[PDB]
Amino acid sequence: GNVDLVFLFDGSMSLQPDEFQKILDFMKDVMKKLSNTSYQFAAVQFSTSYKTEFDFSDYVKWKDPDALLKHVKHMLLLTNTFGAINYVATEVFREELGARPDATKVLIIITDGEATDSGNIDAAKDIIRYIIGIGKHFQTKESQETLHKFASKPASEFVKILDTFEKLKDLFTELQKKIY
Numbered sequence: 361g362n363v364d365l366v367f368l369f370d371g372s373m374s375l376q377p378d379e380f381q382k383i384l385d386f387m388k389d390v391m392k393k394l395s396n397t398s399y400q401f402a403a404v405q406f407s408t409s410y411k412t413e414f415d416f417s418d419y420v421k422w423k424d425p426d427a428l429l430k431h432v433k434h435m436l437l438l439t440n441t442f443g444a445i446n447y448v449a450t451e452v453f454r455e456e457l458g459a460r461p462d463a464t465k466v467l468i469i470i471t472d473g474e475a476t477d478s479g480n481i482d483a484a485k486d487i488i489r490y491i492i493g494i495g496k497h498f499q500t501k502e503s504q505e506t507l508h509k510f511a512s513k514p515a516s517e518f519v520k521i522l523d524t525f526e527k528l529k530d531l532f533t534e535l536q537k538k539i540y
């Protein structure tokens with residue numbers, strides 16, 4: 361079956377340059393490992409504001425992850441996660457931007473800290489949502505649990521807590537094996 365997958369990636373000032381680069385490299389690696397499959401991809405950077413770095417139609421045009429993310433600049437502002445998820449739901453999953461009506465909608469949210477905004481993500485309820493929380497801001501159970509509201513249920517499936525950015529590589533086998 362077809363899968364339309366969006367990477368929603370944190371560009372806040374909490375991320376160090378090498379950490380941000382590791383997020384980019386992970387997205388590229390995931391795409392390369394799923395090239396010429398039923399997958400199509402889009403990517404959105406979020407910080408204070410939201411930017412579609414490439415749409416599904418861009419992916420279909422280029423099919424080159426290096427090219428698609430070549431123009432990304434680290435935003436270096438806040439962490440407005442609620443609005444970011446709603447932005448994906450309303451502004452990226454659109455047929456006119458290459459989204460396929462028959463596809464399963466999937467979000468991979470990648471962040472290094474707690475949201476600086478609030479509200480709800482009701483608009484994104486029909487999207488299958490994974491969240492990857494990385495690094496020392498998620499050392500405590502309480503901090504980890506703040507991510508549950510953004511992800512699908514059960515949290516034990518959809519919330520991934522990684523202690524280091526180097527651990528992103530450990531997700532590839534699992535991601536490749538998913539059958540939606």
Ligand SMILES: FC(F)O[C@@H](Cl)C(F)(F)F
Nearest residue numbers: 468490520531534535538
């Ligand atoms: F299932 C895919 F969406 O990848 C999952 Cl395991 C994710 F956690 F890496 F995002």
